[PDB]
Design a protein around this ligand. Structure first.
Ligand SMILES: [K+]
Ligand SMILES: [K+]
Ligand SMILES: [K+]
Ligand SMILES: [K+]
Lengths: 93, 93, 93, 93
């Protein structure tokens, strides 16, 4: 609970920061900026969008090193503290 | 066994859900929809396909956060509870 | 040693299998086939190459689920049993 | 501290080595060479850049197997020994 909540808030703030940056510096729509932020921090990287400016590339490097840690943390706790118990509870007939 | 079976079923259902969504909203062939779902949840992300609609992008964001946890879980148990023993058994002359 | 050797051989065989498949079914040069196999199993996925046939896509799905487990295993042991000690040994003045 | 410092230096050197290689063999700007090195070793892989020469592809294969181990190590310690405590310290009213 309290741990998953913190991680949830930290993830939300991280994605908000990305959305604001890419819509500003790279000129993306806010929706596309959020899309790029997620596709980046989860390391999926389709490359349908990518930073065209040097500022954009430099920020993204730092965004990645800082962002991956907490994003996968959230993903991990979400799966281990939320999804796991639920699946088990559904396996009791 | 019982753990790997559950994870196997959960993975199958997850991929089925993706196949139905992308063939519907993004208009992909069912085979290409399954292909995108896998390439997404394993975080490979070639970008040969990517969602063009806003609905598609929003769903994929949620699909990723929810899907990665179980997909890598399956991958992990598959390697640790199935592949590992087999390799060891083949190393006894 | 014996563990890292096994993992090394298993990785080599896996990459050889990929090289043969993609040069055959997708018609890539052997070098490009090996390149795609690695870029796939390490989950990097540039998408400079991607399978164009349905056979190619179906095989790759299976290749991914089976291959990621051992490839990251090798990567892990390589870093924990080989790179780690070496760095420490270089930190003794 | 001493552990995070070492990992920090090892990461810096790894990225420097990549920058020099890609600007030399693939003819990228130094900034784009660093960009590719990071996007590669964190496994994001946008594919906005990718090696066009066989030398480039062969080196990158080796760069990946060697580089991922330490890069994610740094990312891990950064998140567990630096980001984690800080967030907790900010949660004390
Ligand atoms: K990727
Ligand atoms: K990618
Ligand atoms: K890509
Ligand atoms: K990845």
């Amino acid at each position: 609970d309290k741990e998953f909540q913190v991680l949830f808030v930290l993830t939300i703030l991280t994605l908000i920061s990305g959305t604001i940056f890419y819509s500003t510096v790279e000129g993306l729509r806010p929706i596309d900026a959020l899309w790029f932020s997620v596709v980046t921090l989860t390391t999926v990287g389709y490359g349908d969008f990518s930073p065209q400016t040097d500022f954009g590339k430099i920020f993204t490097i730092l965004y990645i090193f800082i962002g991956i840690g907490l994003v996968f943390g959230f993903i991990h706790k979400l799966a281990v503290n939320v999804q796991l118990p639920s699946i088990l509870s559904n396996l009791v007939p």
